Amino acid sequence: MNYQPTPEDRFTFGLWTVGWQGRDPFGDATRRALDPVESVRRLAELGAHGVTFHDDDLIPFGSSDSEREEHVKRFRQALDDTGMKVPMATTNLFTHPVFKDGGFTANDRDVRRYALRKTIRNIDLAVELGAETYVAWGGREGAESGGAKDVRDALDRMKEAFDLLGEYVTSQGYDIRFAIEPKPNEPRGDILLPTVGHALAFIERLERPELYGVNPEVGHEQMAGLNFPHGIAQALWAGKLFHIDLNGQNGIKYDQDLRFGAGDLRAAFWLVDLLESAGYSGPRHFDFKPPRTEDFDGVWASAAGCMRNYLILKERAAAFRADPEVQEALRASRLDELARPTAADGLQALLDDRSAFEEFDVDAAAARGMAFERLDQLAMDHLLGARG
Amino acid sequence: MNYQPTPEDRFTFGLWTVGWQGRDPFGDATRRALDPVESVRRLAELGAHGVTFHDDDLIPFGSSDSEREEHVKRFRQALDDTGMKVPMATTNLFTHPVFKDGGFTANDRDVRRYALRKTIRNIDLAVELGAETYVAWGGREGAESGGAKDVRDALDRMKEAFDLLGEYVTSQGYDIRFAIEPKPNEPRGDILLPTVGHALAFIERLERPELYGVNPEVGHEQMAGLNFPHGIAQALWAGKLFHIDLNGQNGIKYDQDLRFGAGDLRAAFWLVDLLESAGYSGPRHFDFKPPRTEDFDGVWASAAGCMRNYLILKERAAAFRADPEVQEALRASRLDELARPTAADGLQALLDDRSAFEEFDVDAAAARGMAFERLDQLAMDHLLGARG
Amino acid sequence: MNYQPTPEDRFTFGLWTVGWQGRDPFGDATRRALDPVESVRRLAELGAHGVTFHDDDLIPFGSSDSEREEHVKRFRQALDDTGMKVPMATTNLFTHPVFKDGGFTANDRDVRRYALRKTIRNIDLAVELGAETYVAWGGREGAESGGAKDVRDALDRMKEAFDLLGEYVTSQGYDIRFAIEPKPNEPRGDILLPTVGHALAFIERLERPELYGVNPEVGHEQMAGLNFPHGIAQALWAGKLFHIDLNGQNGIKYDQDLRFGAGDLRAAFWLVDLLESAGYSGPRHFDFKPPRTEDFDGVWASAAGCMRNYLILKERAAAFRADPEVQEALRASRLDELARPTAADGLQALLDDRSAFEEFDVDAAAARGMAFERLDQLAMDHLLGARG
Amino acid sequence: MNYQPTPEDRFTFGLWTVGWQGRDPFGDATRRALDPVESVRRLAELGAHGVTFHDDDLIPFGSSDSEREEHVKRFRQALDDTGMKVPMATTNLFTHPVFKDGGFTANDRDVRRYALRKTIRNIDLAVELGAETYVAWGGREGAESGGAKDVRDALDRMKEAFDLLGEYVTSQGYDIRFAIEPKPNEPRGDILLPTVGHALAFIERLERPELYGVNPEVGHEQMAGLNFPHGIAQALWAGKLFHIDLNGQNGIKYDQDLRFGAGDLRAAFWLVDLLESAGYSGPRHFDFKPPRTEDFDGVWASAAGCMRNYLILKERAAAFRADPEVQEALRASRLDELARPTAADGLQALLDDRSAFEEFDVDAAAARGMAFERLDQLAMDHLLGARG
Ligand SMILES: OC[C@]1(O)OC[C@H](O)[C@@H]1O
Ligand SMILES: OC[C@]1(O)OC[C@H](O)[C@@H]1O
Ligand SMILES: OC[C@]1(O)OC[C@H](O)[C@@H]1O
Ligand SMILES: OC[C@]1(O)OC[C@H](O)[C@@H]1O
Ligand code: NI
Ligand code: NI
Ligand code: NI
Numbered sequence A, B, C, D: 001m002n003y004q005p006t007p008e009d010r011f012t013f014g015l016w017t018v019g020w021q022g023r024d025p026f027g028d029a030t031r032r033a034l035d036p037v038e039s040v041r042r043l044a045e046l047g048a049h050g051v052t053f054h055d056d057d058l059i060p061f062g063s064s065d066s067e068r069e070e071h072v073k074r075f076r077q078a079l080d081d082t083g084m085k086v087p088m089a090t091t092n093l094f095t096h097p098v099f100k101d102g103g104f105t106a107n108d109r110d111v112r113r114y115a116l117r118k119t120i121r122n123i124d125l126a127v128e129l130g131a132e133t134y135v136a137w138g139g140r141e142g143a144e145s146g147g148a149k150d151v152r153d154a155l156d157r158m159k160e161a162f163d164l165l166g167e168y169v170t171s172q173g174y175d176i177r178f179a180i181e182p183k184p185n186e187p188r189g190d191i192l193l194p195t196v197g198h199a200l201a202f203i204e205r206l207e208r209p210e211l212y213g214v215n216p217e218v219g220h221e222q223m224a225g226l227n228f229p230h231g232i233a234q235a236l237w238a239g240k241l242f243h244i245d246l247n248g249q250n251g252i253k254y255d256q257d258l259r260f261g262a263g264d265l266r267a268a269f270w271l272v273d274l275l276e277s278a279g280y281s282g283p284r285h286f287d288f289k290p291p292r293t294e295d296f297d298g299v300w301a302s303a304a305g306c307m308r309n310y311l312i313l314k315e316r317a318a319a320f321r322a323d324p325e326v327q328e329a330l331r332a333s334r335l336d337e338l339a340r341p342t343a344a345d346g347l348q349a350l351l352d353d354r355s356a357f358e359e360f361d362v363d364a365a366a367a368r369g370m371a372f373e374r375l376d377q378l379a380m381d382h383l384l385g386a387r388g
């Protein structure tokens, strides 16, 4: 009815999102820089719950320890003034030229040691600001050519780095968990751990896997042509959806980071349906870039639209699931039977069950339509508000 | 010098590859069916090591137990006559209309029970023929629309199915392992476990993960735009590369299944380099389709070219790694340093090491070129046989 | 309010769409064949305006001249009984094995001559049934490998074929125009004239270009990652949008042919906006496949949903353009200025205009935001029926 | 034997290629700027024939008329000192913020007039330096959202701009032709005239089409998944290949601009085969970026590798076509018959030829294999230097 967000909806934004100045590989900045304090204040006015940051977004690279304390205190006063929270933070291991061949998996060992120290420094700061999740996006971990990177040795180095970070937070007693953010490419030709599945598999080889989950981004899995709600379902099934980055992407091309709801709208519908039906309770974080065509009024419009589109889709997905005609259609398509065990009776009874093979009427079973198109048109009508 | 294969090179082919009759979604078959015995004999003459099969390739669907024994005995006599082996087998859970919504994750429970019994029947046959690996490709597990498949319930059903199959082989005492073959799409709109990473992650949630690995296919990961040698490296790092399907693919489109070496030739070079340097010792299996333009002479030509291209690339990758100028280039690009631990000295010494942060010269480190382009041009010259 | 189609909405369907039996490259048919007469009757009941056909959909391949006349007369009686029209027809030059290397650009000259005679035979039949457009989809014109097809010689052969067909219809006095339907790949590895742009360029080299236009399909341009409404705009700008195939596609992969509205929903919105604002008056033809999961009740549901989704999107696009707040936003984003000539004053006055260069304030111009994000969120709200 | 380039091989490089400082959307520059004079000298030493430039690469934006003359004179002295030529130039209408919504199709009319004056100024300079081709890449012409750009009005504006530029060069008497460079996306979400086909079609609607051709880039057509040699063949067939940009791209993702030969190596082979067999005589221009991992020694290595790989592939493609076994294979696959007219006898004799339809043996024709796989393996063996 009214799609007004409140801090209760847990919407969060990175400083680097509304603060993106619009520099792209072919053009100069179109907007001036935003003071972090100014972004916190404007986002609070729009109904956001909190903000996130990379170390270098908050404290400019090379800052003296005294300049550092000054930047943090001003930030903390804006948070106190507005009620905004800081649920996640991350490290910039991709902008400075020293990270041109990676941070944790750089071929040069001294760069890998520096990347870990820069990371540990910001974990301390994140805990101080109350963050519960620490994200890692290995944007420069990867290669443009085959001989440049032995990927088994690089995964060893990646494992070593995350194991050391887990040792660090456990030895310090911190209540923070790690979330790896996959991306298949850009800025490297191929990035290691390119999808949610590769990241989930990797985590199972860490020494303390319970401290690590994923931070998937809508557009990154779509850059590989994959179904984002399906990957999120697999992450939820594994118990590893620790955080999520929401935005939009129009297919397989450069990372667009459009506002949430733009891009593949039906995938956004099915994502919100899943998050809300699974009871995901973390932040709904937007990692987006207001297009460089926009002035600052367009930046705030784009940020507001992120939140608005989430709340419209939440209403439509709830109306879909609550509709008795949809519930009947779900039974007609046997979603109830999918949720029942195949063989709770056990292996031996399955083998002795002649109705499962010797006397199974395969032709009768094959003729049964699944009724999925009528179900999908009910979902389309609900999304478009065309139920009457 | 001479690129002649021998059974020692372990090249294997599925019956369904050379026997593909050329039916595609827009056209009729262009070739008559091949008798399996005839394929075994022709492949042996070409230097292959063995063949693989789906149950329905060897025994036509619906066969009586007596027709079954007859088809198997003829096959076994061809194997005895030629020295050919059968290292892998698999189940067809995708062609019959009863599998239109899947086998293990079909919404209908009776279809899921039938799919397991059809599978178990062929595992027994595979063990009898001496197969060491049983492949599962869930070609119909997936969906064209969002509401048709709850993916968490479907992963529960998938886990239940593989757990029951593991219970079966362990209770029977069989020495066979399972290999899941990922594919991102086609014939379903999205297929569950779409990439090597999703399959590896899934396996870690099975009750006896040691019985399960992956069977990646070159073209399937490329249908998601991913780097196949990188995914194979991750599978090798995890200890899960139990088998591999070799073929070629020209980018993101329908599954072409071209002969190996066609498609992305440099990725084929880097794949062979990795397999041979990691000492992969399983079968080099070709899952390919000779194009429907071809008559049977072109089918055998295409099969021979699979083997030929592997052996040329093996020679070029070995020449690359053995070249002293390449070894010097690898050190110049610090591949030796990538293989050294980042912090064997431990967390505490890293934190107290001022050379890792307080006194690290980031500008000096940043200026060091990685020399990857000279290394990659040496690899190009070796691939093209242009070293002089 | 009520999204009921009538024959006035000009919705048409190919016989091969609702009649697709569900055979795909990995599985058998899931539905029995439909008699063309039965499809005409069922589609009329749903509110369709007419049907289209390939020669081989209506008259089975190899039919005797007498069997032929019989199939046509039964069809014509169904059309008379229902009021259905036949606005377009086409030729099947892709299913029979003789067309495995193409019809018009087959390397074998005798096949190319046969393809033209099979085509001419059906043009006569289409005119008899009252078709105004004859579509050509060169599904097999192309190659899997580089040496198999000299593309300059193949374009010569393609031009020769269309020139001869134009000579034929002009010599017979027929009032029919030709529409080339591009597709980038599938079933050939690469298909010639792969996009709307390549087809439009080709037409300009024909002897009588006025007889030829394009028949773009939503999903085909999306298989190349292109923006379909943009390509349709270019076709409309050139005066060549003679017909259109509507369906849905989820990105770059095999040709899904989903029902219209599925796939990229926002692109469907912008397509309907363009067609209706440009006053396109041809048929709105659905070239779709009801998924093979469906029985015949699902086939009719899917066909009805094609029409329903067009009419919902038509209502939302009209509400968008009629909204005074949207009209103000369009002026704020200077769409009115885009439609004004850049230099109606002429070249010399442009060169002497110091306000265009010497005294142009580039910094002031650069600071002006384009306001596109607020405009796009108004379009999203209209699409979702969330204006209040 | 020796793959040493000489100026006779006509290899050219843009100033912006070797001079790319390595700034990407996620990171800072890794290399200092190169003085244009220094690049001219280094490229001459490597065997290049000439260089190309955007206006802003040579003369920094905002330069005074006196600073301008100074930059040009220094450049001209380097050209005189080295023998280097300047065969092409272009305009930068994409970096400055004023071009954020385009140059020729910007919604703001005053920006469109400025873009034309900036262009005309550099055409005069290009003619002075002896360029024969003027390239236009409309990198910012396009949109991220549907309502922001009416594409018919934008094509009107694009046509108006190129028509005015043609009026200008004809009124000045200049001997220069225009080449439009297509790209499907990046930096805009969708770019207008996204492929070679759309550009060729557009040119036919200009007032003086003979002055305009295309400048295709390998990686740009591959960003749409298209076959670059096929698109080049269509451009050659139309008589419009006025220039070409050579580089490499690994599939559908961000524009990588790798050195030529990297990316899809077999497509590079077939491109060189086509260019050399068609007798293309323009510049072989590399539009590439040495990866930001590299220092200046790696920049020159990467530039040299562009030239080296062209010359290796030229030798292998010539060996392929000269091989008598390949010539026999081409006849076996009926490439000779593809080049013969389908119906030089004319329409009426085709209609009366019973051997073309009534008495055509379609089954006999269908059984003939095309022998394309043996031909393609000969091409692979030649590419890899594996003929013995
Ligand atoms: O997507 C990448 C990003 O914007 O920068 C890194 C951080 O993790 C964030 O998600
Ligand atoms: O790729 C799919 C395939 O050809 O059919 C199933 C089997 O696993 C084999 O790999
Ligand atoms: O899309 C291809 C199709 O379904 O078959 C050929 C006809 O042109 C129709 O469009
Ligand atoms: O590819 C784009 C580019 O590098 O910048 C514009 C010029 O046309 C050149 O081709
Ligand atoms: Ni992103
Ligand atoms: Ni992110
Ligand atoms: Ni495949």
Ligand code: NI
Binding pocket: B181, B217, B245, B287
């Ligand atoms: Ni396979």
Ligand code: NI
Binding pocket: C217, C219, C220, C255, C256, C257
């Ligand atoms: Ni289609």
Ligand code: NI
Binding pocket: C181, C217, C245, C287
């Ligand atoms: Ni179509």
Ligand code: NI
Binding pocket: D217, D219, D220, D255, D256, D257
């Ligand atoms: Ni490029």
Ligand code: NI
Binding pocket: D181, D217, D245, D287
């Ligand atoms: Ni270029």
